[PDB]
Amino acid sequence: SFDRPEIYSAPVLQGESPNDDDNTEIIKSFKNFILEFRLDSQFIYRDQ
Amino acid sequence: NTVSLPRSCLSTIESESSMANESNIGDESTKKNCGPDPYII
Amino acid sequence: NTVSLPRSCLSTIESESSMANESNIGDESTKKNCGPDPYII
Amino acid sequence: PRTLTAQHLNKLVSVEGIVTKTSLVRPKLIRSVHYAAKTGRFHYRDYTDATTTLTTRIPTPAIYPTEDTEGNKLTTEYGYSTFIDHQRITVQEMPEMAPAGQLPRSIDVILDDDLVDKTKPGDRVNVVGVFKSLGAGGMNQSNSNTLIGFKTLILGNTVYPLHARSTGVAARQMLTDFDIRNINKLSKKKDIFDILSQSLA
């Protein structure tokens, strides 16, 4: 009578050079667009 | 976020614990078979 | 006096009574299916 | 064991014989208890099998729980669970009664809880119990094989050791107050040693 084993991870090293058309880079670019894009000197999307 | 409920019980493929293997068998030689579409919401 | 237990529940083919046909359906559209080898001695 | 036939099934019987081999006393799981870390609650579950009840019942094969209803992980409490003992023995017809030049007959017996270690191999034993049949004799599914029949055994509920000559079981008699009075009276005479000596053979 035992319980279930677990699984987990942690980052240590740097993998291969990231390609442009991959989901993580797409997400990063979208996040940058949300948090940085300026119109009339305003952070419209962050504010809204 | 066409999803369907599992067709068969997942407790077999999911070997959660060592005692689960015992629980998955009992009453002599009769194999455990939950039947088709055994899940309820 | 190689007989084997029935493979499927016989209450369907055995239309014993009028109310048995009603009892053979319930909980909306789900069809009744006892499963394979549902009999115990 | 030789004169025990199918016509006695499901009926209370009393068998006599010699124990030929016992089994290792193992614990059986009955109720399991678990603790939830994310909520601080204690859950439990119960288990059962075919041999714990005389009347047939519809199986309820509950699984061993590892998660909470909400998805939280679970921790087991071995000290708060419950276990029960279980032993299996084999009984054979006595050699002072079995047919000579003929192989012997034997029957299995299952003991539980407080009747688990009351005998050892080589004893003469009298067991009173229920002669039962279990499972399905290959009837379910196709099971083209027809040679095998129904499994049978005794749900033993009374066990008695019997003394016999040239056997490892000692003889013991219960002493009554009349016996004690008589023996104590007899002890006080002066020729008791002579009387006892002459009593022999």
Contacts with C27 (C-beta within 8 Å, 6 or more apart), sequence order? none
Tokens of D161: 């050791």
Task: Specify the pairing of strand D151-162 against strand D106-112.
Answer: parallel
Q: How far is B8 from chain A (nearest CA, A)?
A: 21
Contact B9, B38 (CB under 8 A): yes
Experimental technique for the deposited model: cryo-EM
CA D72, CA D41: separation in Å to the nearest integer?
Answer: 11
DSSP state of A16: S
Q: Is A3 within 8 Å of B18 when comparing Cβ atoms? A: no
* D156/D130 Cα distance (integer angstroms): 6
Closest alpha carbon within chain D to A3: D66
Please state, in angstroms and as integers, the Cα–Cα distance from residue A31 to each residue in A11, A22, A39, B5, D39, following that order.
21, 14, 17, 34, 35
How much of chain D is in helix, strand and coil states, percent to nearest 5? Answer: 15, 35, 50
Tell me whether residues D73 and A2 touch, CB distance under 8 A: no
Residues D91/D19, Cβ–Cβ less than 8 Å:
yes
Kindly determine whether residue D140 and residue C3, on different chains, have CB atoms separated by under 8 Å.
no
Using CA atoms, how far apart are residues C23 and C34, in angstroms rounded to an integer?
13
| DSSP3 helix / strand / coil % (chain B, rounded to 5) | 15, 0, 85
C-alpha distance across the termini of chain D, in Å: 37
Using the Cα atoms of residue D11, residue D16, residue D21 and residue D26 in order, give the sign of their dihedral: positive
As a whole number of angstroms, the distance between CA D62 and CA B24 comes to 9
Q: Do residues A37 and A45 touch, judged by C-beta distance below 8 A?
A: yes
Neighbouring-strand partners of residue D131: D154
Resolution in A for the shown PDB structure? Answer: 3.3
The answer to whether D47 touches D32, Cβ cutoff 8 Å, is yes
CB contact, 8 Å: B36 with chain C? yes
Residue C21 touches partner D, C-beta closer than 8 Å: no
Residues in chain D within 8 Å Cβ distance of B29: 135
**Does B touch A (3+ CB pairs < 8 Å)?**
yes
Largest CA-CA distance found in chain B, in angstroms, rounded: 44
| Cβ partners under 8 Å of residue D169, min gap 6 | D123, D124, D161, D162, D163
Contact between residue D121 and residue B11 where contact means Cβ atoms under 8 Å apart: no
Can you tell me the distance from the alpha carbon of D23 to that of D39, in angstroms, rounded to the nearest whole number? 43
The minimum CA-CA distance between C23 and chain D, rounded to whole Å, is 21
Please tell me which chains touch D, using 3 or more CB pairs under 8 Å as the contact test.
Answer: A, B, C
Instruction: Tell me whether D59 touches chain B (CB under 8 Å).
Output: yes
